[PDB]
Design a protein around this ligand. Sequence first.
Ligand SMILES: COC(=O)[C@@H]1CCCN(C(=O)[C@H](Cc2cccc(O)c2)NC(=O)[C@@H](NC(C)=O)C(C)C)N1
Length: 163
Amino acid sequence: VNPTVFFDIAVDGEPLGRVSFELFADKVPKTAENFRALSTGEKGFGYKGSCFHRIIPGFMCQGGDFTRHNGTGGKSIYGEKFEDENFILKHTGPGILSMANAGPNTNGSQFFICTAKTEWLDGKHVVFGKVKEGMNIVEAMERFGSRNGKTSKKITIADCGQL
Ligand SMILES: COC(=O)[C@@H]1CCCN(C(=O)[C@H](Cc2cccc(O)c2)NC(=O)[C@@H](NC(C)=O)C(C)C)N1
């Protein structure tokens, strides 16, 4: 029952590959549904064409700011922000998909994909999914990051949807 969504990643416009995610709607249905709908675009906005604005090798890839493209924007399907649904799931290692935020109960559309175990974020960021196929593509994206997170090539979600 858990939805599978995919991102087709491009690097300076050149196709790199596909990442697919399992969304844990059985544990975090509201958070899963937000990401699922932003990945299909069915509400009229979402992730297609957006970029990954911060990539830190050995930590995480951050994206989902489809309104300001720099970490300051994005919005949920429910409004600007929604609650931390729960913290049942933990940041157990690479491939974990979790919500970025600016404080308690401020989820929008920004998310991050862990490339390492990030247990210090447990209880503060809502984990809602995990990479299914294409962790090697996330590892490839990682190489275009830097210590301060600035990317050396433009990493975009060229296409996305539900599988
Ligand atoms: C260098 O680390 C980050 O940039 C982190 C990685 C996880 C996702 N994330 C956020 O949720 C960060 C908070 C954070 C968490 C952990 C470490 C940090 O330095 C900063 N938040 C943001 O980027 C948001 N808010 C602000 C005020 O920056 C944006 C979603 C509207 N950014």
